[PDB]
Amino acid sequence: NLWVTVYYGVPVWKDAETTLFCASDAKAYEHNVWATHACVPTDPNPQEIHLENVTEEFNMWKNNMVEQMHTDIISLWDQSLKPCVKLTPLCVTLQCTNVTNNITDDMRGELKNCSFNMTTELRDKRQKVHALFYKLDIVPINESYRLINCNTAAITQACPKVSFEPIPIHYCAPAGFAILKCKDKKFNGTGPCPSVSTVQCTHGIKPVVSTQLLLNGSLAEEEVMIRSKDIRNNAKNILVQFNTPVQINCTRPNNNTRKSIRIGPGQWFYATGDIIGDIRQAHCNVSKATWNETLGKVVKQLRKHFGNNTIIRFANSSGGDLEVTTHSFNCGGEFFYCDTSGLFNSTWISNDSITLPCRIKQIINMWQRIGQAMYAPPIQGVIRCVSNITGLILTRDGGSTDSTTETFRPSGGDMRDNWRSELYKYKVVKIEPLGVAPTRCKRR
Amino acid sequence: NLWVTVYYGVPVWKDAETTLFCASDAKAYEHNVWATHACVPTDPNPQEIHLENVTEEFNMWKNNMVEQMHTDIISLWDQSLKPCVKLTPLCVTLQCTNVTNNITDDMRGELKNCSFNMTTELRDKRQKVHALFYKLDIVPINESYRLINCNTAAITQACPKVSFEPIPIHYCAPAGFAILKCKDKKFNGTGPCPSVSTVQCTHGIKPVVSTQLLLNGSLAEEEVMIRSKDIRNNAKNILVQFNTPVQINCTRPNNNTRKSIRIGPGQWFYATGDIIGDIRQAHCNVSKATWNETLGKVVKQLRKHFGNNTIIRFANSSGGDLEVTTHSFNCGGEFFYCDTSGLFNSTWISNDSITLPCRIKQIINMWQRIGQAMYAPPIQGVIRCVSNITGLILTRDGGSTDSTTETFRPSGGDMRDNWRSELYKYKVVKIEPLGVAPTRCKRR
Amino acid sequence: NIQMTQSPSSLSASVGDRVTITCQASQDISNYLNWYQQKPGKAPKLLIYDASNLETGVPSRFSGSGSGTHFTFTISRLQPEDIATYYCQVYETFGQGTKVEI
Amino acid sequence: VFLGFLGAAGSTMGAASMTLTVQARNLLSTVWGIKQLQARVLAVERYLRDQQLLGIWGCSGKLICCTNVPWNSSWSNRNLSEIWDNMTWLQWDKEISNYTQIIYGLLEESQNQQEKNEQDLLALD
Amino acid sequence: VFLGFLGAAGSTMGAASMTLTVQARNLLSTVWGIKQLQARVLAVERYLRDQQLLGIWGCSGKLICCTNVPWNSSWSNRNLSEIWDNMTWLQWDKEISNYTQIIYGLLEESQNQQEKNEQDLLALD
Amino acid sequence: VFLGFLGAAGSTMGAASMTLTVQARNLLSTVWGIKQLQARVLAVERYLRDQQLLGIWGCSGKLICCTNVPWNSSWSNRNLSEIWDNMTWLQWDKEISNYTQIIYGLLEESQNQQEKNEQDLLALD
Numbered sequence A, B: 001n002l003w004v005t006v007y008y009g010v011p012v013w014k015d016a017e018t019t020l021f022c023a024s025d026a027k028a029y030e031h032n033v034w035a036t037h038a039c040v041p042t043d044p045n046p047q048e049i050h051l052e053n054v055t056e057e058f059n060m061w062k063n064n065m066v067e068q069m070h071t072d073i074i075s076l077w078d079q080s081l082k083p084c085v086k087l088t089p090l091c092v093t094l095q096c097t098n099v100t101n102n103i104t105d106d107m108r109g110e111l112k113n114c115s116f117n118m119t120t121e122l123r124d125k126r127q128k129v130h131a132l133f134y135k136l137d138i139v140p141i142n143e144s145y146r147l148i149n150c151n152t153a154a155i156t157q158a159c160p161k162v163s164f165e166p167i168p169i170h171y172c173a174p175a176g177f178a179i180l181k182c183k184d185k186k187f188n189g190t191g192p193c194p195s196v197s198t199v200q201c202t203h204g205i206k207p208v209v210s211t212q213l214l215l216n217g218s219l220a221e222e223e224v225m226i227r228s229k230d231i232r233n234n235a236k237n238i239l240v241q242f243n244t245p246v247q248i249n250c251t252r253p254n255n256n257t258r259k260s261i262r263i264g265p266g267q268w269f270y271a272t273g274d275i276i277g278d279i280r281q282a283h284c285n286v287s288k289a290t291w292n293e294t295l296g297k298v299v300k301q302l303r304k305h306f307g308n309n310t311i312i313r314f315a316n317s318s319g320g321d322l323e324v325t326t327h328s329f330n331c332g333g334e335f336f337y338c339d340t341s342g343l344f345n346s347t348w349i350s351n352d353s354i355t356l357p358c359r360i361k362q363i364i365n366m367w368q369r370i371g372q373a374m375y376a377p378p379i380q381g382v383i384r385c386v387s388n389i390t391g392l393i394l395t396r397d398g399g400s401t402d403s404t405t406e407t408f409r410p411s412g413g414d415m416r417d418n419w420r421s422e423l424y425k426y427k428v429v430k431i432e433p434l435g436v437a438p439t440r441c442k443r444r
Numbered sequence C: 001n002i003q004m005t006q007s008p009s010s011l012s013a014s015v016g017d018r019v020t021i022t023c024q025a026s027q028d029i030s031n032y033l034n035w036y037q038q039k040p041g042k043a044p045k046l047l048i049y050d051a052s053n054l055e056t057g058v059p060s061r062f063s064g065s066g067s068g069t070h071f072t073f074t075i076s077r078l079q080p081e082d083i084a085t086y087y088c089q090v091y092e093t094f095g096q097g098t099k100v101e102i
Numbered sequence D, E, F: 001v002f003l004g005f006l007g008a009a010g011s012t013m014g015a016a017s018m019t020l021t022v023q024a025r026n027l028l029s030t031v032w033g034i035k036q037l038q039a040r041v042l043a044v045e046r047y048l049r050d051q052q053l054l055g056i057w058g059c060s061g062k063l064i065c066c067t068n069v070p071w072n073s074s075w076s077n078r079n080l081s082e083i084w085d086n087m088t089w090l091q092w093d094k095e096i097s098n099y100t101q102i103i104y105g106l107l108e109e110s111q112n113q114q115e116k117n118e119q120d121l122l123a124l125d
């Protein structure tokens, strides 16, 4: 009656994990932290096929593309930092005084003028040099100063030519694998997606390294989206995706120099040196009204999970490192750490601009590795910066004695959640082209 | 009537670029700058098939094999220099005097006896050592001397065991690719070649690094060959291939020592130290008559392009570095720079030996990289050397006010033209084995 | 070396009409002839390279065609931004130059 | 090449069986260089494993191959209409994955092996 | 192995069609180790792409395969003598490369696909 | 997969010819990563060389393939019983390895090539 028939090319897939190569246009330059050793050129025709009558189970919280991106970004940081100047002769005693230049009261003590002995191109001669160092980079040797990492880690200067500006990268699957995109606009990243397509590569994802705020990310199409591995678990971060972005205006007003010091036979140390004009605090402005309407939308969407009559409180971070207690980020080449206590300070009952002070740092341990730190060279001129706040990473306060109110604070640190906000709609699947089915046909 | 028929194995090819592996006999030794990490053993039976009734378009000036050889040779130099002694403790003040030994008037000031403090195997002890350094390696610290690269680059000693003698390398294509050889004996490297063959690998090409003169290269079969990307463009180098070679006799008459200085726990610095006997200038002899007949042939072939009645003038190089202003080369392990002003000094109207003084250098930046230099250790004894001048790299003088005369000067520096002289007759092609053609046959 | 003759030596034309400048080389030079524009008090600006290709950022009204010995530069419309001296060039040699005029 | 890839994934199995070549053409194309090379090599050997499975049956160089293995109603008791006009290949794979290895074993146990041996013997008479 | 490789490249297409195996046998065989491995892997997947193209037509395991695609005089209007006795395969490729993709599309569009489906159906009666 | 691998290595050739699929399934699956990748790539291209050899004969997608090459008694003058019932495949390979290349040359010289050309011509009448 019926016989086994073998079909090859059958459209069937399974869940699997694989290594995804990265496509990138990579135009310009004639010096990129990422697309120079790992990724490859883009695709002129990005082809997306809508899989009709297809409902597919997605899970952004068990997506191996996020882990692959984490490993790739860390490794690419390390590779970019490998061929640069090692700053081991700068772990010496530093004689430091306060800056005599005109300094605002807020910036008093933040910057130190430090004189020290350094190596020259000739190993038998020493030079007396001086440099400006931020107070967050400088530890007193006793109750004479020293850099912060000298006790724990060796320091490597970042190559000034290499730029820290994120460029989009598309994650593409090899042959025999596919990337399924969830096209549902209300999708919270877990469960069945009815509107599915297949793509060669993901969209252009900028590897933006930041805490407490998702800058230059994608925007929700319809409404603010609240996503969490377990919304009832306070230990799990809450990813908030905006539908309209909030512009953020960051700047370091100091007109800065870059003094070159020949530390070795061909090695250069780029210190700050001097500031032309007045000295003022670096800061970030956001619109008060825009932030108000965005927080109102976030509260409206949080009340879906936490009840309609509950009071939603926004408070600043409870504690941690400077990376997680502040909106830490990097644009213009310098590393900002901005106090978001003015962003999150509200109580929403169920019924102009904000200026965030920012502190700059030059010694950074980005991924908390042991025995490795980076010196960020100073940038010549005045650095300004404009970005779209497109989301938040929040943490709900646990152990609440009062059941009527819920408190949410900024969070971050683990950047796997920064790119979970981008890779939530993608899923790697594995084509099983061989099928067997009954047909009336019989081999002779 | 007619039907599509599919043929596989069709002899059709296209122009393409690929990575070519290198075959080499690699006999001897029980320490080669090239065939130790990159290339592989040779082929007992070099098989060449003449492609009859085949006319193929060649272009030596857009040959990717030349670029591949450039990258391979640079990378192989770097790899050979990686596992050797870094000479960073030799960038110190050097107290230098003239050499008290019997010195000829030509060699007065060329060599300096320099005393300096050096590290020992124990880091807490220093040694007073002295070494002989050529004047071209030594810069005065002020208007006390220093090596030349201390301001700009770190220096690495070349491993004395590793020899700089070129060995032939054959460039072979992978599967699905072929190397077509142009067998025409009058071919100028561009245009259709009627006599074509196919080979597994190129001929044995010695990677000879030199300027202004092609040493140990291939010889033209019939006549002196003038080749240029554009013979009317003065900015394009003219490659001259000889039909009969000119022997060149090079020597450094100094009987030299190699003093070993333990600079580190297991690191050794090999200085010159002392000279046994008289001191004389290094030099290269060529036969005056042989050079005369070769230059007459070159003039005869240049007049084909530049007119029959024009005056062909040979003048020395207009300027540049010591690499390009002199015949720079390396045989015996030491780096010679020979004044070819006696080679090129003539005026040819349309109708004994020459001795070239040579200066030796030990600090060499071969490929003008940034932050990298090499120290060439001295060679024990008297180095002599015999080579075949098999060609020239010339540059025509532009903007000539006088239309009756043309002036040609030595050129070089870009070694991609040194191996363009060898890879001019080869072309990588890409087999397209699948064809479709009409036949009367019809599938059942 | 390669002598050049560029004509017309001086040209005056009203807006809208086409301007055809001709460069004649002293021998076969393949397609290696370039056309530059030089406004007064400014450096020359390359419009045509290799006698047919158009430099990026140049309006399409500029065009060039030629080979061997003879080359032609065509400006279809004498728009007011275009008043400048136009030069042909082969290798080291620059043409004598022609100045359009309104 | 990529056009229509998996487009019939939600089609019926009968309708998705007319698009097998779009999904068959798409199975063949520093540390990250090693990663890309590992991906390419894995794809190649996977494709070759599938082709070997097809070839040890009578299904070499075929995207649809009829066999001599009878269908057992212990694997699926649906009639052809439910399979080829009401169900998709993903649902069918979910339903039949528990017996797939038994079916493969039967495909290479007796039918192709005894067929080949019988054709060895029929080429004697 | 390498003997006679491309030796009939200048022969007529008819005469070069008797030497297809010399050109078919020759398509299958630190940082430089990675370079050689990339070359080998590329050759392998290229060969497999060509074999897949042959197999999605009826031309699996064949160096000469007759098809059911008629020849269109819009691709070439020469008579068999000009093609197989006066022209070489390189000249033919230069002449026919503009239509090659149309021919490949026709080879896998209807003839092998409808043939296979019709053989699926002829194995019922 | 690995079960029974080479288990019939000491069997007679006739008896070991019923187990060809266990030995056919087993031919397809930092510096040490490069070593493993080189091993995998070598296995792949070796398998493809063997399949190409089978395909340039009439033996594509077949583990047993009858040919049109007569047996020469200069290669072995044993009768079928001594070969298929008294000898093993290892002993046979030791005996016949000196002529293997002649046999391969004859397999691809005339039989498959002239057969294919004759089937090209028989598809005309």
Ligand SMILES: *[C@@H]1O[C@H](CO)[C@@H](O[C@@H]2O[C@H](CO)[C@@H](O[C@@H]3O[C@H](CO[C@H]4O[C@H](CO)[C@@H](O)[C@H](O)[C@@H]4O)[C@@H](O)[C@H](O[C@H]4O[C@H](CO)[C@@H](O)[C@H](O[C@H]5O[C@H](CO)[C@@H](O)[C@H](O)[C@@H]5O)[C@@H]4O)[C@@H]3O)[C@H](O)[C@H]2NC(C)=O)[C@H](O)[C@H]1NC(C)=O
Residues within 6 Å of the ligand: A161, A163, A165, A166, A208, A215, A216, A329, A330, A331, A332, A333, A380, A385, A386, A387, A388
């Ligand atoms: C979110 O996304 C936003 C949009 O992408 C980002 O904002 C962008 O931030 C980048 C990085 O700071 C900005 O890029 C800079 O832009 C300037 C040049 O662009 C234009 O600027 C001028 C007017 O503003 C204009 O005249 C120019 O012609 C140009 O159009 C410069 O600040 C800067 O250029 C510098 O870029 C090189 C790499 O940084 C640098 O090497 C060069 O300077 C160095 O070298 C030269 C030559 O050797 C020397 O002369 C210099 O002294 C120095 O040594 C060069 O000057 C850079 O390109 C970008 O403009 C900005 N976009 C917008 C729309 O604002 C955010 O940063 C993102 N946010 C986060 C958190 O990632």
Ligand SMILES: *[C@@H]1O[C@H](CO)[C@@H](O[C@@H]2O[C@H](CO)[C@@H](O[C@@H]3O[C@H](CO[C@H]4O[C@H](CO)[C@@H](O)[C@H](O)[C@@H]4O)[C@@H](O)[C@H](O[C@H]4O[C@H](CO)[C@@H](O)[C@H](O[C@H]5O[C@H](CO)[C@@H](O)[C@H](O)[C@@H]5O)[C@@H]4O)[C@@H]3O)[C@H](O)[C@H]2NC(C)=O)[C@H](O)[C@H]1NC(C)=O
Residues within 6 Å of the ligand: B161, B163, B165, B166, B208, B215, B216, B329, B330, B331, B332, B333, B380, B385, B386, B387, B388
């Ligand atoms: C163009 O092409 C030309 C032909 O190839 C090149 O000329 C060649 O140049 C090379 C390199 O200088 C010459 O090779 C040298 O030849 C000598 C040995 O060969 C013969 O010499 C003796 C007679 O001359 C004879 O008795 C010998 O038995 C032998 O047959 C030596 O100068 C030298 O040998 C040295 O080679 C090792 C690598 O250089 C070296 O390590 C050895 O010495 C070191 O080690 C030993 C043992 O540890 C110690 O005892 C030593 O003190 C020292 O530490 C060894 O001595 C080398 O092989 C070649 O002969 C020459 N050929 C011709 C025909 O002239 C040109 O150079 C090419 N031109 C260019 C520009 O590239």
Ligand SMILES: *[C@@H]1O[C@H](CO)[C@@H](O[C@@H]2O[C@H](CO)[C@@H](O[C@@H]3O[C@H](CO)[C@@H](O)[C@H](O)[C@@H]3O)[C@H](O)[C@H]2NC(C)=O)[C@H](O)[C@H]1NC(C)=O
Residues within 6 Å of the ligand: A098, A099, A100, A101, A113, A114, A115, A130, A132, A273, A274, A275
């Ligand atoms: C950090 O402190 C250093 C000193 O350690 C400051 O630089 C020094 O400042 C003095 C006083 O301004 C300079 O002296 C002056 O120099 C000018 C010429 O440059 C001369 O005209 C004046 O008469 C006077 O001598 C001195 O040169 C300079 N450098 C040194 C090595 O002493 C530096 O400005 C301080 N930076 C900040 C931001 O406060």
Ligand SMILES: *[C@@H]1O[C@H](CO)[C@@H](O[C@@H]2O[C@H](CO)[C@@H](O[C@@H]3O[C@H](CO)[C@@H](O)[C@H](O)[C@@H]3O)[C@H](O)[C@H]2NC(C)=O)[C@H](O)[C@H]1NC(C)=O
Residues within 6 Å of the ligand: A249, A250, A251, A284, A285, A353, A355
């Ligand atoms: C973030 O917002 C703050 C607060 O509005 C901005 O500071 C304001 O910046 C303007 C423009 O520079 C200042 O105006 C100028 O001030 C000085 C002193 O009078 C003088 O140079 C000029 O006459 C002019 O008035 C303004 O005073 C200043 N206000 C305050 C309260 O600091 C800041 O620029 C914004 N930063 C961004 C967008 O990066």
Ligand SMILES: *[C@@H]1O[C@H](CO)[C@@H](O[C@@H]2O[C@H](CO)[C@@H](O[C@@H]3O[C@H](CO)[C@@H](O)[C@H](O)[C@@H]3O)[C@H](O)[C@H]2NC(C)=O)[C@H](O)[C@H]1NC(C)=O
Residues within 6 Å of the ligand: B098, B099, B100, B101, B113, B114, B115, B130, B132, B273, B274, B275
């Ligand atoms: C470069 O200069 C050094 C000195 O810095 C020269 O070596 C030194 O030369 C002196 C005088 O010849 C040596 O003194 C003599 O030593 C011998 C024994 O070796 C002894 O018999 C004599 O009575 C006399 O003392 C000295 O030892 C030697 N070394 C040092 C460290 O001083 C060297 O020769 C010079 N090189 C050249 C090429 O000119």
Ligand SMILES: *[C@@H]1O[C@H](CO)[C@@H](O[C@@H]2O[C@H](CO)[C@@H](O[C@@H]3O[C@H](CO)[C@@H](O)[C@H](O)[C@@H]3O)[C@H](O)[C@H]2NC(C)=O)[C@H](O)[C@H]1NC(C)=O
Residues within 6 Å of the ligand: B249, B250, B251, B284, B285, B353, B355
């Ligand atoms: C390159 O050519 C020059 C010039 O012909 C050669 O120099 C000559 O070399 C010979 C052999 O060494 C010298 O003869 C010897 O000279 C001294 C002083 O009389 C002495 O040791 C012996 O009695 C013998 O005569 C000759 O003087 C010398 N001539 C000149 C003008 O320097 C040189 O050797 C050649 N170099 C090569 C082939 O590498």
Ligand SMILES: *[C@@H]1O[C@H](CO)[C@@H](O[C@@H]2O[C@H](CO)[C@@H](O[C@@H]3O[C@H](CO)[C@@H](O)[C@H](O)[C@@H]3O)[C@H](O)[C@H]2NC(C)=O)[C@H](O)[C@H]1NC(C)=O
Residues within 6 Å of the ligand: A052, A053, D007, D008, D010, D011, D012
């Ligand atoms: C997604 O599933 C739906 C069913 O839920 C599929 O809809 C079917 O689409 C076909 C092709 O367009 C329709 O056939 C056409 O129908 C009418 C008669 O109704 C006739 O005018 C045409 O001759 C043609 O056959 C069919 O009616 C329709 N069936 C429904 C809605 O029940 C749809 O194809 C699936 N889409 C995919 C897999 O992309």
Ligand SMILES: *[C@@H]1O[C@H](CO)[C@@H](O[C@@H]2O[C@H](CO)[C@@H](O[C@@H]3O[C@H](CO)[C@@H](O)[C@H](O)[C@@H]3O)[C@H](O)[C@H]2NC(C)=O)[C@H](O)[C@H]1NC(C)=O
Residues within 6 Å of the ligand: B052, B053, E007, E008, E010, E011, E012
């Ligand atoms: C290169 O092209 C030439 C034609 O331009 C080809 O020459 C032809 O070669 C064949 C085979 O050797 C000759 O066939 C022989 O001819 C004579 C009668 O002329 C007869 O004695 C033999 O029975 C045999 O068939 C043929 O005549 C000759 N034709 C010419 C010169 O017109 C040559 O084969 C090509 N070579 C290649 C592709 O290697």
Ligand SMILES: *[C@@H]1O[C@H](CO)[C@@H](O[C@@H]2O[C@H](CO)[C@@H](O[C@@H]3O[C@H](CO)[C@@H](O)[C@H](O)[C@@H]3O)[C@H](O)[C@H]2NC(C)=O)[C@H](O)[C@H]1NC(C)=O
Residues within 6 Å of the ligand: F007, F008, F010, F011, F012
């Ligand atoms: C190793 O070699 C021995 C021979 O030296 C092989 O022994 C043979 O094994 C077969 C299969 O078990 C026996 O067949 C059976 O024999 C009896 C009649 O004797 C009958 O009851 C059964 O119908 C069956 O056919 C065979 O007799 C025996 N022959 C001998 C000992 O001469 C053995 O198979 C080899 N083992 C391997 C390759 O694993």
Ligand SMILES: *[C@@H]1O[C@H](CO)[C@@H](O[C@@H]2O[C@H](CO)[C@@H](O)[C@H](O)[C@H]2NC(C)=O)[C@H](O)[C@H]1NC(C)=O
Residues within 6 Å of the ligand: A247, A248, A249, A285, A286, A287, A353, A386
């Ligand atoms: C942040 O910077 C942007 C520009 O990068 C500012 O946008 C401009 O705002 C001014 C003042 O209202 C307008 O006149 C301009 O038209 C705006 N656009 C541009 C392109 O300049 C924006 O105002 C800044 N936002 C702040 C300080 O809240």
Ligand SMILES: *[C@@H]1O[C@H](CO)[C@@H](O[C@@H]2O[C@H](CO)[C@@H](O)[C@H](O)[C@H]2NC(C)=O)[C@H](O)[C@H]1NC(C)=O
Residues within 6 Å of the ligand: A216, A219, A245, A386, A387, A388
């Ligand atoms: C900040 O956000 C705005 C709004 O999303 C961005 O402007 C959009 O840019 C996209 C780029 O594809 C365009 O398609 C939209 O039309 C733009 N929208 C508007 C309203 O202009 C803007 O580029 C973002 N800026 C940064 C620095 O990321």
Ligand SMILES: *[C@@H]1O[C@H](CO)[C@@H](O[C@@H]2O[C@H](CO)[C@@H](O)[C@H](O)[C@H]2NC(C)=O)[C@H](O)[C@H]1NC(C)=O
Residues within 6 Å of the ligand: B247, B248, B249, B285, B286, B287, B353, B386
């Ligand atoms: C360059 O050196 C070669 C040998 O390497 C010399 O050739 C010898 O020359 C002498 C003197 O005329 C002859 O007796 C020998 O027979 C030649 N051959 C050999 C193998 O020694 C050559 O003369 C030198 N050329 C110069 C100095 O111009």
Ligand SMILES: *[C@@H]1O[C@H](CO)[C@@H](O[C@@H]2O[C@H](CO)[C@@H](O)[C@H](O)[C@H]2NC(C)=O)[C@H](O)[C@H]1NC(C)=O
Residues within 6 Å of the ligand: B216, B219, B245, B386, B387, B388
């Ligand atoms: C210098 O050139 C001569 C002439 O080309 C070389 O001698 C030839 O060497 C080849 C090597 O294959 C032989 O086939 C020729 O018979 C030789 N010719 C003569 C006339 O002897 C010589 O080897 C070259 N020397 C160097 C050092 O490269």
Ligand SMILES: *[C@@H]1O[C@H](CO)[C@@H](O)[C@H](O)[C@H]1NC(C)=O
Residues within 6 Å of the ligand: A097, A098, A109
């Ligand atoms: C220098 O700054 C420190 C804070 O870093 C402050 O305590 C001290 O009083 C200052 N000294 C001065 C202005 O002399």
Ligand SMILES: *[C@@H]1O[C@H](CO)[C@@H](O)[C@H](O)[C@H]1NC(C)=O
Residues within 6 Å of the ligand: A188, A189, A190, A191, A192, A227, A228, A229, A230, A231
């Ligand atoms: C996400 O949406 C699914 C339905 O698609 C729902 O079952 C699940 O509970 C949602 N997750 C949260 C945290 O609300």
Ligand SMILES: *[C@@H]1O[C@H](CO)[C@@H](O)[C@H](O)[C@H]1NC(C)=O
Residues within 6 Å of the ligand: B097, B098, B109
């Ligand atoms: C040492 O040599 C220099 C040239 O390098 C010369 O000017 C000086 O006079 C010499 N001194 C002596 C011989 O004392």
